[PDB]
Amino acid sequence: SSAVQYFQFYGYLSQQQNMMQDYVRTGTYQRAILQNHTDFKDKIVLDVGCGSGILSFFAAQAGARKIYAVEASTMAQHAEVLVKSNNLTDRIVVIPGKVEEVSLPEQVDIIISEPMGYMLFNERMLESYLHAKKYLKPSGNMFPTIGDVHLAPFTDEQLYMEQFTKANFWYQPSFHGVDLSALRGAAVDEYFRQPVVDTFDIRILMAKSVKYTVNFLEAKEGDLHRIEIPFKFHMLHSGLVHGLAFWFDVAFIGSIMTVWLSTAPTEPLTHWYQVRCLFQSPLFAKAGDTLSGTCLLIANKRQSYDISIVAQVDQTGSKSSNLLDLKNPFFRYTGTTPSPPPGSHYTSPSENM
Amino acid sequence: VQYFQFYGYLSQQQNMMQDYVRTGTYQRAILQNHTDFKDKIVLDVGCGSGILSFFAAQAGARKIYAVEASTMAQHAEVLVKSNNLTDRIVVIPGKVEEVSLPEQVDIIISEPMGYMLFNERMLESYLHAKKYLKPSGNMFPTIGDVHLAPFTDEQLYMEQFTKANFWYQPSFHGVDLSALRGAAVDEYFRQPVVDTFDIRILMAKSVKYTVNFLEAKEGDLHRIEIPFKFHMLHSGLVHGLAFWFDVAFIGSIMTVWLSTAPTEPLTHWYQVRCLFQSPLFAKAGDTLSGTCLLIANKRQSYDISIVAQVDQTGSKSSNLLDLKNPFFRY
Amino acid sequence: AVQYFQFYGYLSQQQNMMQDYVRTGTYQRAILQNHTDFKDKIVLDVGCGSGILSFFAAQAGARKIYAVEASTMAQHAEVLVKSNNLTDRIVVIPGKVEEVSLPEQVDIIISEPMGYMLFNERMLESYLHAKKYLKPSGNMFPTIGDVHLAPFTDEQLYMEQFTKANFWYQPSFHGVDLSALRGAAVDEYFRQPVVDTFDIRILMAKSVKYTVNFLEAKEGDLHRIEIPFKFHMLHSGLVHGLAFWFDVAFIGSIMTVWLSTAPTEPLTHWYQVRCLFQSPLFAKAGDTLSGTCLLIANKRQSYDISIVAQVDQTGSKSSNLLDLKNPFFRYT
Amino acid sequence: SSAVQYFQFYGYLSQQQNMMQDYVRTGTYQRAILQNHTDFKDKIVLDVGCGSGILSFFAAQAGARKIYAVEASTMAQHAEVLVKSNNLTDRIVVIPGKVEEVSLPEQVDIIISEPMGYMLFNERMLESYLHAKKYLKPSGNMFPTIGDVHLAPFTDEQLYMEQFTKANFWYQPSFHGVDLSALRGAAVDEYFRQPVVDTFDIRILMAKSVKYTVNFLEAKEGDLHRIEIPFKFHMLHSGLVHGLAFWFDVAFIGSIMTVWLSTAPTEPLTHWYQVRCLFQSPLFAKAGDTLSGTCLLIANKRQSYDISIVAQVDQTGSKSSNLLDLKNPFFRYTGTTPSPPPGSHYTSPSENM
Ligand SMILES: Nc1ncnc2c1ncn2[C@@H]1O[C@H](CN(CCCl)CC[C@H](N)C(=O)O)[C@@H](O)[C@H]1O
């Protein structure tokens, strides 16, 4: 259905290029695969969504005997050219098609893949990554092995006001002689259903994070159809909570060492950035209060999730419920350094010049 | 399809409404020609928010049929009710090709122009809607002029060549990508560059291609052939062709023009530039002749072929372009 | 070989080198400050040109100076010696220092044999060959040479050369397809050393050094020169190639004097030299750039250069050929 | 010899590019071949020193049946690659070697070449071009067909002084304590033996040019070993004559039309520019005087000419005799517009602004 558009997007070389040029990502995968050469040398490997084939080449540098590289986009055509020109035709096998519908010659010793999306789960490629375990030997391994999602409440007044400023275009009685007021509410609802793709200063976060772990060795493809993330935040600061901030970490658990790829706002940026879900009604909280609630991710037919966030301040009973659409996020990043919150100065800035 | 979902968002209707030149030229063109709307029947093909039907209602139209296929039709009918015009503006959800109208109309109004005028292939629906048009009916816009002109922009050319050279690395993290160097260059230079530019970079007076919406058939736009013969005013490197367009509202009281030229204030259409993989050298006085051929595709766009040659020297350049994968250089 | 000595046979070239104030004044100061290494001694000037260095030796008190010059500049040199009244101290001997015979062994050899990257022109071999005339505790001015290498980032230069090479990427230059030769064009242009100066900001790691000791080295060492390097990257960026320059030291009895062609120092007719990678290498600060620069002597009195550079963390490798015989003089 | 250094120079693609990028040169050759297609249509052609092969390609565009493209530098290898990739292997035969020492299968109907150097004659490739006539049918044609060398007396005080300024470096009694004066005369002599490659404003010319024609259809290889150019100038202006200026034209005399390629200072610049030979003793002449003399080019073993220029003003008998070496010219061009001589203002500049 919408799979056509998805595989059209990853068929352009310029997109593969954007992902390969993310040094954090490609470098961490290369480090993780080569530093665990005992997990690869002369073993069988499966690259789920090989794209250019970069990960299979990394697997080859580690000494794999044979690597099955599955690719469903037309990038399979270009991928085979790199294997022939890198004289690895005898160890890398390009298979055009989807990992679900293809046939593999044999069970593999280890599976490698880069299936993470915004908030880890977006794009629903982890389901294909776990589906691939039907080709995995009883003692096989998976790179990445586990993925951790993180959540924290945030305060950002300017991000929050921005939505009503954009929507208030509709609240004028004579836009070229037409009254648009009747659509203001609908415009507001639309903008708040967009998760914001951006970075931020860590000082806007108001409580230590909370983590939902997906163990790719134990999880089933069905575990990813309904993801329920409960949270109970102890506020470090007492502000207005305009929503929740999401990021993720993944770990490659190999024989020699475990390697981490992290997209935290404390780490170097990546092409995943961070994702923020705004509350249409911000929640006020004291410091020490508990912000309790649930984040419910419900898979949809269009390769994404419907996000439901219900949060409440237990001491005051103040409740906020929000719905978001992760397939239509708002890309807000600019490149500017992130300005810090006001009221973050505990000593005179003038006496520090 | 993805197309009608995109235009189902209020934020997109807003982005196009906040284009002041576009909206104000449409309103002024309609209002100053209120005689072509007084007590008449109107069809608005793709009304979106309904802004154009409201312009028609302001001009005195007795009844306006507003066809919209995206979910925007629901919101459009909310503005009709809250503006107390429900007896004059009739929203009809669906595609103009599929809906049934109660009667024939005196005039069709629409905003079907895309990049290079032809993008999005909504002109075909604007023309197809003429099956509901009375024998002497009129159309806003009446005609569309596509303008093309050769340009020189060294920075843009090296900008794209730089990105294509990523695929020339013999050892990117130990991997040889050079085998794909050729596909990378094809793909990048197959990107129309959507942006504005200063008129300084044009090396010849523009050439014009006219589409008359009153006389044209939906089939004409399946394959559009634009021949060009440029007379070069300056010497140097021709890195490609630049496209922009004008449309004219030919009404009873006056004709009003809407332009996306680089000398005029900016629109959400900007201008479009097609790059040659290898620029062409030309002197002042030379002639640059060739053909730009647009063949419609199933993905709501066109496959573009540009054949150009310097007649004096025989230097030839052939380029195919994908209007489906633009490069917004904003 | 004939073309080499015709070139240095023109008085205008000798002028171009003599008008290099840093060069000529540093040689005089190094010679005169160490006058005890010259007083009442025998001297050999290898490739005297106009004679300038022999005149510095006579100024320092040398009893007799043998000035060897193989171009026709030897005859002009003889004229300056007569008109400067030094016929009893400076003896011009025409011919190559490899082929002439000298009346006695010398206490010190002086020369100016450095070329681009120090080794260009392959005159250091003749400077070292002349050591057969050197007494057991003799000295040599210059005494040691330090070649310096450092990676650099310079986008405009890289695209400047790529623009030139891309002329051969045309499908119809006057109706003729040249694209079949784009690969040969890029190979040729990027084989060209870029002779120019540059601001030290473009360097991304502290320079690495390769030292030649003229007192100890033998003429054979310079037929194949292997230069290892291991750079610790200080900035994150694209490495577009390596930059080369050199210092030489006059290690005299009284003091050591240094002559430098570094980009932080005033300009010399040697400028600096850069080798471009066809495909730049990406490196982050903290990474290590390791590799080898290899100079293989050839018949045209120059070197075939092979530069292999590698980012140790990422495995990005780059191998480049360079022909010192076809440099690109970019200075204007 | 110098042949080695000569053919090494033309093996670099950057050099061929420099010559191909001279639009005047390459464009005029293309026009001259294509507009005379009757001289090429289904005929046998010989391209002497093809370099990239460009001229052969032009002759193929005009319809020639077979072209023999002779090249002595290693550019011959790259020339064959262009012929294969342009699908012309059945009509263009690249022959590596020197035109004097190679063999052709057959006689040709027409010979094409670009053998002109500074002052037309420099580098001595016209001799190879004329030598190639051993392969020409009794009524064959040659492109170019005739060459015109133009001479004219000029006045340029700043160019003239520039030489003494450069040589007077040697006229100091203490250059780091060394008296250099003895070499001043030798230094002056050296600089004046350099012809100057540059362009100039035609107003520095003091008499109508004189021309010496070589007819390539009739000239013999030995004619070019000793070239005697008598001149007799009628001075249009009174002044100091600092030397003579040289340029050249070639004409392609085809069946349909004659096409001219000119390096005159009145025409668009080319990579040949113009060449000026300075007199060490300038000659004074007033308008109406006659400047008579001879310009004698004596071929030498290093692929160039020794030039002797003797001029005298007949009215005064004032003589000047100068020797120049064409193999060590001074390339003076910059790109600055040539400033016009003083005082060429016959009307007040202030009354014109
Ligand atoms: N069902 C599927 N079967 C096979 N491949 C798929 C499938 N779904 C998505 N992919 C493939 O995975 C590639 C993208 N993917 C990262 C997206 Cl965040 C891996 C890129 C590359 N191998 C890297 O790791 O850097 C894309 O080419 C896509 O087509």
Ligand SMILES: Nc1ncnc2c1ncn2[C@@H]1O[C@H](CN(CCCl)CC[C@H](N)C(=O)O)[C@@H](O)[C@H]1O
């Ligand atoms: N094998 C040789 N034997 C004798 N002379 C040689 C030899 N090789 C080169 N030379 C001569 O020494 C001169 C080299 N020259 C600059 C080198 Cl970049 C030094 C000029 C002179 N000492 C100054 O600094 O002013 C040239 O004149 C050359 O002819």
Ligand SMILES: Nc1ncnc2c1ncn2[C@@H]1O[C@H](CN(CCCl)CC[C@H](N)C(=O)O)[C@@H](O)[C@H]1O
């Ligand atoms: N005796 C010879 N035999 C064969 N080749 C020769 C001979 N003498 C000179 N050449 C060759 O002709 C080429 C020079 N020629 C320009 C001279 Cl200013 C090339 C122009 C070329 N046809 C263009 O227009 O691009 C050089 O490549 C040279 O190697």
Ligand SMILES: Nc1ncnc2c1ncn2[C@@H]1O[C@H](CSCC[C@H](N)C(=O)O)[C@@H](O)[C@H]1O
């Ligand atoms: N065949 C078709 N039938 C009906 N509506 C169509 C259509 N093709 C496109 N549309 C709709 O027409 C609109 C194009 S832009 C609408 C802008 C509006 N006329 C204004 O001036 O503000 C979109 O809402 C699109 O979804």
